[PDB]
Each structure stands twice: as C-alpha cells, then as structure tokens.
C-alpha cells in the first residue's frame, strides 16, 4: 500500500516533469506569420429544411454527397447535398440521442444517447429499406459518442468514466476502458482506426488503444464540462470544446494543451469543433448564436457565419472539402461554400 | 434540362419531406413533464399514484393528452449536463415529504428539499417554465407533531401548535423562494393519498401554461 503510493507519487512527478520539459515554444510563436485566410464571405447555397426540433449531430459520408443529421425529435436523415434531396429517413427508438455515425464502406450507420445503448443500422439491403442490425448494451451511464472502426467493430463512450470497443458481429465487448473520474462525453476516431481520444467532464482527456484496453495519456487544463471533441485528420492532434467559453487544441503526443481560443467579449459555451479538409479552418460553434470560423493556426480572428438565431450544436466538413454544414437549435441546417 | 432519374429523385425527396413534416407536426401535441425530488423523499408513492438504466419513460394518457413523465432518478451525474434537453417541457413536478419535519438525516430533510426547490426555481433554462409542488406524508405529520415542538427546524416561529398552523408555515416557506413571480409561478399542494387531486392539480397547471403560450403567441 505505502510502496504503491510512493511509486504512484514518483510516476506523477515524472509525468509532471515530462509535461514541463515540452513547453518552450508554441503554435503562435511559430505559425503566427502564416498568411491569414482573410474574410470568408461565405454564403448560404442551400437551406436543408425539415427539422422540427433542435439538431444535435450530423456526419458527412465518404462520397461527399450523402449526409446524415439527427435531431432531438427522433429523426436521422440521409440526404443529398448536390440537389437538396432526401434519400432516407430513419426513425429512432429514444429521442434523447446525442451522437451519430456513418460507416466508411458506405453500408451502415449508428446512433446513441442517454438510454445507454449504441444501435447499428444497415443500408444496402436487397429488400428495400434500412433496418437495425445491432443493439449494444453494457454501459451504465448515458452514451455520448460513437465511431465505426470497420464494418464489424464499433467504439462507444458514456457518462461513467467508461469507454468500450465492441465486436459488432457477436455483441460482446472485446475490451473496455476505465480510469476517468467524471462523465465522458465524446471521442474522435483516428484516421488509422486504431486509437481514440475521449473528453470527460473533469477537464480531462484520455487516449486509448482499441486492441488492448489500456490508456496511455491524460491531458488537463480546463475549468468546466468539456462538451464536444474532434480529431485532426492526420492523427497527431485533436481539439475539444469547453463550457467555460474557450476552445482548445491538444496534441496526442505533447502531453499538454497546445492552444486556447477565447476573447474577452465571449462568455458562452462551445458546443462543437470541427476542422476543414486542409486544416486551415477550425469551425467552432457557440451559444452566442454564431458559428465562427477560426484561422486554426493563429487563433487570431473570426470569420463569421452569422446565419442562425439560436444556439449552435454541430458542424462538419466533407472529405473533398467541397462544403460545410452547420446545424443549430433553430431547426435548420445550412450548406455553405 | 433533367433526365428521368433526376425527376424520380426529386419525387422521392418531396415525398420524404411530406411524411417528415406530418410526423413532426403530430409530435408537437404532446405534454412533457420532468420529475424531481430528493433522495428517500417518498416520491415513489407520488410517482405510482400520480400518473401525470438511462431514463424511465413513464408514459400516460390522460384527458386525451399524452403525458411523458421522465423519471431520471437512475442517473448519477450532475444535472448541468443533461437537464437542458427538456427545455421545452411544460412542467417540473416536485416531490417533498412533510414527515421529516425534524428528523435529522445527518442535518434534516426539509432544509435540503428547500435547497432543491430554490435551485430548480432560479435555473436559467426554467425562466418561463412552471414548477408544480407536492408536499406529502401529512397524516403521519398530524400524528407526529403531537410530541415534537415544531421549533427544532424553524427556531423563529412561535405559532399555535395545531396541524393547520404548522402546515401553513410549511407551505408558505416552500412557496417563498420565487425570485421571478413576473414570468413563472410556483403552485403548492399537499399529497391527498385518498384523493385523485394529485392528478387534477397537475393537469390544471399544464393547461394554464398552455393558455399562456397560445396567448403570448399573438404578441401580447
């Protein structure tokens, strides 16, 4: 007991020393000279109408044309961006749903929410509909985020200090993850489908391997609940949204927070962060009703998509970078370029 | 300047929108209520009788209206991350017991119940949403005050030691903490174990908030 406590204290001191050893110069002391994106006079091209309630999540498909978005009304829509056509409408089992997923091979989707369960639907059926193929249970607190690893593996996280990797084929948790202290709200899957980083409401982020189950890193630096997390498309960094009116960009190797986005006249929450395809725009939503676009390398200014009249909740980009879609509490979704 | 396939795609999209809007329009004629209270509050009796893990979605149909009573008591998380999802509910139903008027759980029950009622009242999402209150366990209270001096929990009252006097203090002290009588109002009521008033009071509060809604929809 005492020896274990001493070893833990020594390891914590080593971790603190490692964190301190890598805080000499940062992005704004290196990349602040990069050429500004200027004013993104970025205008609506289509208004996807149809939502009868708030929007909580959208996800872009792999063909850059087929889109998925879902509401706290109980609908999950597969929709066409080029011609503003709706391809599929999927009803859900419980409306308190706070995340969605879209399979990379193009055949499946997934959803999850407070009811603690993660559900998987199959698209390319020969009989002419979209049906549910799996229901995954075994978490105890609310389910907040889910990603697809392949056609047969799915990663979920919940409000329990628990994460899990799930074999879709059998329904059995291959390996589960424990070690937070507060509720876990999100995760963002690596481009290589081998890792995931999760944010939890203790100003905490944790990095995990899917095969084993062990955690390898924990980052701190915030002051309230961390609501939304995403991932840099090359697998070296990620960005989280905090409810103390700041956005952050951590690295999955630097073992600390890299940058913070904040301003004096901003005191509202961050409900989502996502990147564009090239990575030179960080699009972040707030409660001040604006879906601001940041120069993600300078944290300097904010091009503004002042189109909405309620809280922002989600936003994403396509795989070829053609369009961006923002979804906010006003029951509308906007396609922009 | 379209082929046949594009025209078929347009037809499919429009059909989807029609059915979607119909379903969404029918899904706005429901009544949504969230249940709250303290631990070991006796709220089980109210939940069973009143009728008006994850979430216990208790559904009821009463007076042609669909009451979704969300019991969220199975959750062990801060309410600050998952309560705002109900910001469209008409009502919060609150349950607290009279019996523990001087029973120290550590201090006593009534102080923390009042903390909960105050916390629900001034919660910024619930600015325009009404709070319906049940005080319960009144027969055991009328029996039990026969020995207690009543002044243990409230060492500033010196009223008559009968049932109605102490009950009037309990009800007024619960109704006291409203800071915003301009927009919302708190309704007080005590649990009628041999009556169905526990249903009618809640129904009337819901109806009144609905009329307020349809009236301030005209700009008044």
């Amino acid at each position: 007991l005492d020896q274990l406590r001493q070893e833990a204290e020594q390891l914590k001191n080593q971790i603190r020393d490692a964190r301190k050893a890598c805080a000499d110069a940062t992005l704004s002391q290196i990349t602040n000279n990069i050429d500004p994106v200027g004013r993104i006079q970025m205008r609506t091209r289509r208004t996807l109408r149809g939502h009868l309630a708030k929007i909580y999540a959208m996800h872009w498909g792999t063909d850059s044309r087929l889109l998925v978005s879902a509401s706290q009304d109980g609908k999950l829509i597969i929709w066409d961006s080029y011609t503003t056509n709706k391809v599929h409408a999927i009803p859900l089992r419980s409306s308190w749903v706070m995340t969605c997923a879209y399979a990379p091979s193009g055949n499946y989707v997934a959803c999850g929410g407070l009811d603690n369960i993660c559900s998987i639907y199959n698209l390319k059926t020969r009989e002419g509909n979209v049906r549910v193929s799996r229901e995954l249970a075994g978490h105890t607190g609310y389910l907040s985020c889910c990603r697809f690893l392949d056609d047969n593996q799915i990663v979920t996280s919940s409000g329990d200090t628990t994460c899990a990797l799930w074999d879709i084929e059998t329904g059995q948790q291959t390996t589960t993850f424990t070690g937070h202290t507060g509720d876990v709200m999100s995760l963002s899957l690596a481009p290589d489908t081998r890792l995931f980083v999760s944010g939890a409401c203790d100003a905490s982020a944790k990095l995990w391997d899917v095969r084993e189950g062990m955690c390898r890193q924990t980052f701190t630096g915030h002051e309230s609940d961390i609501n939304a997390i995403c991932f840099f498309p090359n697998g070296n960094a990620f960005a989280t949204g905090s409810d103390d009116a700041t956005c952050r960009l951590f690295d999955l190797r630097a073992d600390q927070e890299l940058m913070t986005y904040s301003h004096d006249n901003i005191i509202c929450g961050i409900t989502s962060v996502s990147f564009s395809k090239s990575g030179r725009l960080l699009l972040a939503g707030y409660d001040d009703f604006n879906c601001n676009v940041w120069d993600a390398l300078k944290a300097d200014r904010a091009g503004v998509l002042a189109g909405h009249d309620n809280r922002v909740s989600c936003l994403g980009v396509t795989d070829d970078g053609m369009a961006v879609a923002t979804g906010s509490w006003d029951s509308f979704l906007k396609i922009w370029n | 300047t379209l082929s046949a396939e594009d025209k078929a795609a347009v037809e499919r999209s429009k059909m989807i929108d029609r059915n979607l809007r119909e379903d969404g329009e029918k899904a706005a004629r429901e009544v949504k209520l969230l249940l709250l209270g303290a631990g070991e509050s006796g709220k089980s009796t109210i939940v069973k009788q009143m009728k008006i893990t994850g979430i216990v979605e208790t559904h009821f149909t009463f007076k042609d209206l669909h009451f979704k009573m969300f019991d969220v008591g199975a959750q062990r998380s801060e309410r600050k991350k998952w309560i705002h999802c109900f910001e469209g509910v008409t009502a919060i139903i609150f349950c607290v017991a009279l019996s523990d008027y001087d029973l120290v759980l550590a201090m006593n029950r009534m102080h923390e119940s009042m903390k909960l009622f105050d916390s629900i009242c001034n919660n910024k999402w619930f600015t325009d949403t009404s709070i319906i209150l049940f005080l319960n366990k009144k027969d055991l209270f009328e029996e039990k005050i026969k020995k207690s001096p009543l002044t243990i929990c409230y060492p500033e009252y010196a009223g008559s030691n009968t049932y109605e006097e102490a009950a009037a203090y309990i009800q007024c002290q619960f109704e006291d903490l409203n800071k915003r009588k301009d927009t919302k109002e708190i309704y007080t009521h005590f649990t009628c174990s041999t009556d169905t008033k526990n249903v009618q009071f809640v129904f009337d509060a819901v109806t009144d908030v609905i009329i307020k809604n349809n009236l301030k929809d005209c700009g008044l």
Partner: single-chain antibody
Amino acid sequence: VQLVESGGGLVQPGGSRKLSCSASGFAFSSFGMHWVRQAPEKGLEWVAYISSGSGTIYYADTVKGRFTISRDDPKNTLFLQMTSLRSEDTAMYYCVRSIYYYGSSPFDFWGQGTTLTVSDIVMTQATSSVPVTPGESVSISCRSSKSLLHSNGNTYLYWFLQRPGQSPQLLIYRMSNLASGVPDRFSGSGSGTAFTLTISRLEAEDVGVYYCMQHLEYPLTFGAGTKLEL
C-alpha cells in the same frame, strides 16, 4: 427477392388483356416499375413506366392510348391493361424493378415473364453471331442513332444476358457498373454511341443472347440481338 408475372395466354385481336405482377420478399411501395416485352423470335421492346407516388407515367409510341399502367402498394401488386390487340403485340412480357436515388442500380431484378399469343432514338447491333469455344474471350457491340450521354454526367446504356428458357439478368446497369449476383469476369462499357460488352475466360452457361438498351428519353427502344454459339 421474388417477382412473379401472371395473366398471360392466347387472345384474338381486339378485346382487352390485363397482366398482373405479384411481388414478395422486399419493400414493394418504395420502388418504381417498368413493363418490357420481347418478340417471339427477336429483340426486346419497352412498353411502360410507372413511378413512386403514382404521379409519373410514360408509354410507348406504338401503343399509347391502348395501354394503362397502375400499381397497388398495400397488396404489393402491379398491373398493365391493354386494349385493341394486334399481331405486332405477340410477345413475352416482364416486370422490372428500379429505384432512383443517388447511387442506386436500376433494372436490378427481372421477373420470369408471361407469354401473350396474339394471332425515337434508333439502336442496332453491329454483328449477328460469333462462334465461341470455352477458354476464349468474347466481345459484343451495339450502335445508336443519337447520344445517350445526358447533361448530369451519366450514360444510359443497359446490358442484359438471356439463356434458353431463362429470363434476362442485369449484366450492366448504366453501361459501366456491375450488378450483384453476377461473376466478376463480365464487363461492359461504351463510347460516343458505340457500345460494347466483354466476357473473359468463357465458361458454360455464358453462351446465350446479349441485349442493349437506352434510357435517355421516353420512349425506350431496343436492338434486335447478338448471340454466341458453342
């Protein structure tokens, strides 16, 4: 997935006929339907198209006014009713399923075909017969009288295979893409009104008649046919 024709037989000129289609094993009320016919010894001929929502109907130039197409969703059935029968209508019929949304495969499954015995872009084939022996590769063509490449990036050529006693099988939908249930040794493609099909490493059951089709503007017209011979 199962589609079945019904209602054929022998009819004199005049009177009326009604061919029905019973479908089972799939979501009937979300697809669009066609009727396609074939001559007693020759190529195919389109007849009619009906779509989801019962709002769009198209007919053939040779029949219009004599024909009427309809669908019934709750019972999962399809109907085509014809009047004033003539000798040019002696044929064999088929229902065909096809659903339209981004990325679907039209003409995916064919029915069996009923038989009816009765007492304007132009597309033809290039050859008539090529003797074929197993172990060798084969290729077949067609030509059309007008472009099939629409504005929005498509090319509406459809390639089909028929074996003796069998129904057609969707070798190729939209002239470049392969259907489900068919071996990967098949392939098909096209050009500026010149079209082609290929079968590598010829096997048995790969000997039959091969058919081309267009879908750019109603009505739809076929060729006459190309056959390989063992």
